[PDB]
Amino acid sequence: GASITYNVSSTIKGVLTDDGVLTISGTGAMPDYTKIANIPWYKDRDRISEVRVNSGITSIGEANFNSCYNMTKVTVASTVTSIGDGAFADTKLQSYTGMERVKKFGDYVFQGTDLDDFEFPGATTEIGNYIFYNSSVKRIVIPKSVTTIKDGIGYKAENLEKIEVSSNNKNYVAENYVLYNKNKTILESYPAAKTGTEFTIPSTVKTVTAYGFSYGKNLKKITITSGVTTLGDGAFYGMKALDEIAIPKNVTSIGSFLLQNCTALKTLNFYAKVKTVPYLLCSGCSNLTKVVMDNSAIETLEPRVFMDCVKLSSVTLPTALKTIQVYAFKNCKALSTISYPKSITLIESGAFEGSSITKYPTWLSKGNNGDYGI
Structure with a gap:
């Protein structure tokens, strides 16, 4: 059976097994890639159906799983505290497990994803710009922990019907599934598919x-x-x-x-x-x-x-x-x-x-x- 090993850093490796799983193991911050063609598994994107980021990894870097078009699931360990810009841009992301301690999400993280109902994980504090650009997301749920939502959460999220915010969130509120800041002085986002x-x-x-x-x-x-x-x-x-x-x-x-x-x-x-x-x-x-x-x-x-x-x-x-x-x-x-x-x-x-x-x-x-x- 073919098993491919990727050199990520001196403390991080990637292993893509015959079952289509790309497992990131080791310790620390994953690198940031400025060019999609620089990601170690660029030539093997067809083979990746699922990504698992294991305990010890502290952050997912910029564009790490960008254009992994067959990836429908990601498992993110509790040690990961941030997910970089376009980390899952143009993946077939449908669901995730984990992300229990992710505090910061970059820009375009879920661009072009195949999401339906998406709830931001419990420790989320910052949501980057145009995070759902061309994502099929129908519902976004904002937990009480979120303090910062950058411009365009619903930008070109053309199937978005609902934005719901926890009553206990101190900075944001949703009124009739329309996103506002807590004191409704800023109209943040109107879901494109809202009736x-x-x-x-x-x-x-x-x-x-x-x-x-x-x-x-x-x-x-x-x-x-x-x-x-x-x-x-x-x-x-x-x-x-x-x-x-x-x-x-x-x-x-x-x-x-x-x-x-x-x-x-x-x-x-x-x-x-x-x-x-x-x-x-x-x-x-x-x-x-x-x-x-x-x-x-x-x-x-x-x-x-x-x-x-x-x-x-x-x-x-x-x-x-x-x-x-x-x-x-x-x-x-x-x-x-x-x-x-x-x-x-x-x-x-x-x-x-x-x-x-x-x-x-x-x-x-x-x-x-x-x-x-x-």
Whole structure:
């Protein structure tokens, strides 16, 4: 019978037996791998169906079982206190036993996994970023021990229906399976497969975490209440059913690609007190027909804000706008006419490339470098 031995470190070894089990034995911290092709068992990924990390090992390193596509189970001993970035990224992970003393989880640890019901183990204190990216996870359970959950726990966890938090958790809470911080001032994550056509952000919320409502399957409408001041990067990214939204005046901080690829979005009312309309705002909003931007604070349209908005025909620019940057209205085929506010100072070369906008302001002149300025 073939039995393969892997040199992991001076105190750690790996043994892959004929039964498809990769057993990590020895003592200490497993190494961090910066390249997937550097993992010792890279050439034997087809043979690994289960991983066992035995007593003596104190941590699973970065990308250790990354791309072990046939791995459906991991057994983690009580001596392991941390699991590194993408440790099980793109495994067929379905369940685990152990992890009794794991305190820290890195980023993308369970990316592309085949999970259903997942409960974080009893000693978990820190959960890294985008931990379930493309995971099939349907339910996440947060124990009382968790003190830190980084941005995007549900980001591209497209089958996620529920997030449940222990009543005894001191930093987080779940209300109707929606994840919040304990005092509900931050809306952390809305499960993408959670049922419901309408949602009102609680009045107590000041911040919507980056990717909070990303890939949302069912919401047609979101009410951004008066308390919200911050909208994170892609907070409404690629929502399937969102048909309209109003960004109110109270919002003073907006991330990039906020409503990017919301293919059901028909209308945008943007009233946020911000100096710029952020990069990729409504890029790929293929059904967006009307946009109203109204705030005396808005000075700039960053690039690609309405790129490939092929149905966008009416655009109301903010009355004190000064700059339209490259590709802001790239391929806006339906945008035939626009009213320019007298405050415009610069239209960068290519702002209206692919659009049906032919004329530019009278007070602007084409620079010897393609830009329209003074």
